[PDB]
Design a protein around this ligand. Structure first.
Ligand SMILES: [Cl-]
Length: 288
């Protein structure tokens, strides 16, 4: 069963980029949101071992210290194909009618068992929800984790950025600007990197797919003292006007970033948008 799994190395999402299998279908109560908003969260990956980003264990996120509803509620129904994984796909921050599924501490939906048959479920999402304005110290610590060894160039960059930009939002903007101005390539056939994979990507090849960009950005943020994690899921979808629903295929698999700061809580950012805005605005198969 092709699909997202609990870990990924840069390159692994590109392999899904090459699959046209169906992942899920979605029908909205009202108008389809703009494509730029169609970030379908599956899970977060908080552990980086120098090669792969991976899911950590979670606890409950269904409480008011965790998050606060604000802004518009988007209501939609989903039919998911079997994933053989226990994650329901939904726009952040999601609530469902599934009594065996819980919103976890990292704002992903964890089902008690993996989805091994087609599954219909109903969702409400609050994309403007405030997330963890006060962060659990364990969550903070976990999201500053890096290997001690490896990727010295990226650590040097993070140091330089931290010294130049006191405010997290400014540092994040400066990092996004590097992707925007430098000759980065967005490709389904990224060049191989060596052991210092983040350095090789940022400073040598400047070529990758979404996991390269998301993983490298999360690395640099953590090295600069900004808690950050990779978000994995899907972005976009294909409209079926005969049936009035969106299809989301495996080629729509995507990875992005969220980072934390006091008061504002977690904010999501997508470095891919700096290099391949058409991917976001048009969809991968209209771009690549
Ligand atoms: Cl990838």
């Amino acid at each position: 069963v092709t699909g997202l799994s609990e870990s990924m190395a840069p390159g692994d999402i590109a392999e899904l980029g090459r699959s046209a299998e169906l992942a899920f279908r979605v029908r909205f109560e009202g108008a389809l949101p703009p494509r730029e908003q169609l970030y379908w969260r599956a899970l977060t990956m908080e552990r980086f071992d120098g090669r792969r980003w991976a899911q950590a264990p979670q606890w409950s996120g269904e409480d008011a210290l965790h998050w606060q509803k604000r802004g518009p509620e988007l209501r939609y129904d989903v039919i998911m194909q079997p994933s053989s994984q226990p994650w329901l796909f939904a726009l952040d921050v999601a609530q469902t009618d599934q009594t065996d599924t819980r919103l976890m501490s990292d704002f992903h939906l964890q089902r008690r068992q993996p989805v091994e048959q087609r599954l219909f479920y109903r969702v409400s999402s609050w994309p403007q929800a405030l997330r963890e304005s006060s962060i659990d110290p364990r969550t903070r610590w976990r999201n500053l984790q890096l290997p001690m060894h490896g990727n010295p160039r990226a650590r040097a960059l993070a140091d330089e950025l931290r010294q130049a930009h006191a405010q997290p939002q400014a540092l994040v903007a400066a990092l996004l600007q590097r992707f925007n101005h430098e000759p980065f390539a967005y490709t389904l056939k990224p060049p191989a990197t060596g052991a210092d994979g983040v350095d090789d990507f940022l400073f040598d090849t400047r070529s990758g797919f979404c996991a390269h960009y998301a993983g490298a950005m999360a690395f640099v943020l953590r090295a600069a003292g900004i808690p950050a994690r990779v978000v994995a899921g899907y972005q976009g979808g294909e409209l079926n006007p005969a049936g009035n629903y969106l299809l989301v295929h495996q080629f729509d698999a995507h990875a992005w970033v969220e980072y934390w700061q006091p008061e504002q809580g977690w904010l999501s950012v997508d470095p891919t948008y700096q290099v391949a805005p058409e991917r976001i605005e048009q969809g991968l198969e209209q771009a690549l």
